[PDB]
Design a protein around this ligand. Structure first.
Ligand SMILES: N#Cc1c(N)n[nH]c1-c1ccc2c(Cl)cn(Cc3cccnc3)c2c1
Ligand SMILES: N#Cc1c(N)n[nH]c1-c1ccc2c(Cl)cn(Cc3cccnc3)c2c1
Lengths: 201, 213
């Protein structure tokens, strides 16, 4: 059983989320201008801590795992997803602009567990798409719901003059298992050599 | 000026992308994102998109004949075909920069155990195909990855959407719940501020992403 609360100034972006789990989306502006120029200078705007503090006060408890997407976060991995899959309560704080005043996470950490995470090494305009990814990766692991996958095939056995690998039609479990291992190994070496402890291209 | 076509059995999942697009960019003809229901290209009254995996195993595999027809209609020789997959090459910021100058992206979103490999292999004989993963976690299908790719790519297209880690940011008020903004930021010593931010970045990268060093 899990409850997920998502806080965002763009609640409409979280629509694609639509009994063991409830997901609720909250408009941050309900607790109010949410942004201002950064202290110390720099381009863009920073979300003010005041509005966030009030929102999180209401939504979070000491048992909450507060998730804060950020391009500067610890990596969110499958291990993270497994870890979070047994939590009772995730709150995902989605910001925009140049980010959220750091004191929001710092203040929250005095009261609950806080995880600043990034879903990958690319830049988004805000946390919402990251929230969608995190929710999907976590929810599919909730109780009651290494190497790269090799290629998959289905009918027909010949299509546009391209044949399904004959071993897959042979019914030889051992040969099929071995061919699939080899395919995964070749794929991992080519595409993700880091997973096998080699240099990245 | 970019056209993105997304093909999916859950077109409603992609609706927020068309929400995030500013009218000015669309009206200036800088961007067009169209979403297509894969079932438009099914052959049978049951609108089947999947079938059992050759060689056995759990789950199902998306049918090559359905995808083949969809991509035949939507793609041209100039298309960059993007296929999200947990077995893909990593999608990075460098990838996003590269793709941001493309005329036509087609994103093929699958489900279940994947799309019959012959779809991408056949497509690759007449267009550029890119199998990519957005990170080291497992999703149920390509749709959430497509959302991420679209956003990361389009924000690099001039006026469409509107290394070390970045350190912390602060704004008003100067004191909040017992926490003061670091005084250096209010010092007016901008060389010192830059050095402070550099050191914050270094420390954060060591703590959170040692792999980057
Ligand atoms: N998780 C993740 C993640 C990812 N993997 N990329 N971008 C994001 C993400 C997460 C949270 C925010 C917030 Cl709050 C504002 N922005 C825009 C921004 C901020 C600083 C520098 N550049 C862009 C966010 C980007
Ligand atoms: N991009 C990315 C990405 C990512 N970073 N995680 N998962 C995905 C993703 C992309 C595409 C598909 C398709 Cl098609 C089916 N599935 C579910 C699946 C397949 C094989 C093994 N397990 C789950 C997909 C998962």
């Amino acid at each position: 059983s899990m409850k997920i609360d998502v806080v965002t100034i763009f609640p409409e972006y979280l629509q694609p989320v639509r009994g063991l789990v409830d997901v609720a989306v909250h408009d941050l502006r309900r607790w109010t201008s949410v942004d201002d120029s950064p202290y110390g200078g720099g381009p863009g705007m920073v979300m003010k801590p005041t509005v966030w503090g009030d929102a999180l006060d209401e939504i979070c408890t000491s048992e909450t795992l507060l998730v804060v997407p950020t391009p500067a976060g610890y990596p969110f991995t499958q291990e993270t997803a497994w870890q979070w899959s047994t939590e009772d309560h995730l709150v995902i704080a989605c910001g925009r602009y140049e980010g959220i005043d750091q004191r929001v996470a710092d203040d929250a950490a005095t009261r609950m567990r806080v995880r600043e995470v990034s879903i990958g090494d690319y830049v988004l305009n805000g946390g919402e798409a990251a929230a969608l990814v995190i929710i999907e990766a976590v929810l599919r692991l909730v109780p009651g719901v290494s190497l790269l996958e090799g290629p998959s095939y289905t009918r027909p056995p010949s299509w546009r003059g391209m044949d399904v690998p004959p071993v897959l039609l042979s019914g030889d479990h051992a040969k099929i298992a071995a061919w699939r291992a080899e395919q995964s190994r070749q794929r991992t070496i080519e595409r993700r050599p880091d997973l096998l402890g080699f240099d990245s291209p």
